[PDB]
A paper describes a structure:
Here, we report that the opportunistic human pathogen [name] exhibits chemotaxis toward histamine. This chemotactic response is mediated by the concerted action of the [name], PctA, and PctC chemoreceptors, which display differing sensitivities to histamine. [name] is the first bacterial histamine receptor to be described and greatly differs from human histamine receptors, indicating that eukaryotes and bacteria have pursued different strategies for histamine recognition.
There are four monomers in the asymmetric unit,and the superimposition of their Cα atoms resulted in root mean square deviation (RMSD) values of 0.4 to 0.8 Å, indicative of high similarity. An inspection of the structure revealed that it is a dCACHE domain. A long N-terminal helix is followed by two globular α/β modules, termed membrane-proximal and membrane-distal modules. The membrane-distal module contained bound histamine in all four monomers of the asymmetric unit. [name] ligands contain at least one primary amino group, and the primary amino group of histamine plays a central role in binding because it forms hydrogen bonds with the side chains of Tyr208, Asp210, and Asp239. In addition, this histamine amino group interacts with a water molecule coordinated by the main chain oxygen of Lys211 and the hydroxyl group of Tyr158.
Author numbering: 48 to 344
The structure:
Amino acid sequence: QMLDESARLRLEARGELQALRIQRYFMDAFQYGKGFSRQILFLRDQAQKRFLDAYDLREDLTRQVRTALAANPEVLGLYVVFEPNALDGKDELFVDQPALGSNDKGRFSLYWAQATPGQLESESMIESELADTSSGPSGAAYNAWYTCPKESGQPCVLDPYFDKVGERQLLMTSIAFPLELDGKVIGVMGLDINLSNLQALSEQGNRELYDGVGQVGILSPAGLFAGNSRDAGLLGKNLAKADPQHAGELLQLLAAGKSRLFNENDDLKVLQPLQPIPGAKPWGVLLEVPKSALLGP
Ligand SMILES: NCCc1c[nH]cn1
């Protein structure tokens, strides 16, 4: 039977298409963040060249972070952190100025968030929070949304982790940017993305995939579910919870950016890795569809 080969090719292509969809979602947010970081660095340069004073600058940044978050209802939070005195050399003047995005040490450390689109509240991140290395569900340090682009000089897409919005703990990922001046990192900017958005993405793609007869899952590099059309209760959970026998193999395939098909009863599984942004560690889509659907009516 040459039936099995056509079923494999179809699912491989479906796996590729689903990865394109997830990649586009991440890349749209990456575009938006990259464009806004230029606005941040320009304002910083206007103040460095004394065309703009520090009080107006910190006010301007604080307002424009909020406006840029309000403009993208796909984004959960927007944070901006500068190294000490690296925004304007004037941190000492803004100690405990949260209405100007300045924290307990005057460092410009600003967050705007919208738990639902439009309920914009703000926080100035204190030093102990910027330095909190507590391990999360993936093993990664809590403050990787700050230290990751600062250490590499490159953007990062964190594994799912819990963070505070309002006074609730939400499960999320972030696209975090280094703010570089002449090849040196002077600060960090980042977009927070509610994992419920990726859960919706995996459900919507499953509906378009043979009328939802199978399932679509989204895997972060560390192997946490960022989306699972069959059970949202798997958000933030390790792949071994749903796929113990192949968890280990699936994760090394993922990290090596290798695709693979799996035969199981009369169902097919495909793991399709994907880079969410350029150079990022591969995420993946896991697709399972019964063979009878692939060789459909
Ligand atoms: N969500 C990562 C940025 C942040 C703001 N407040 C706490 N953490």
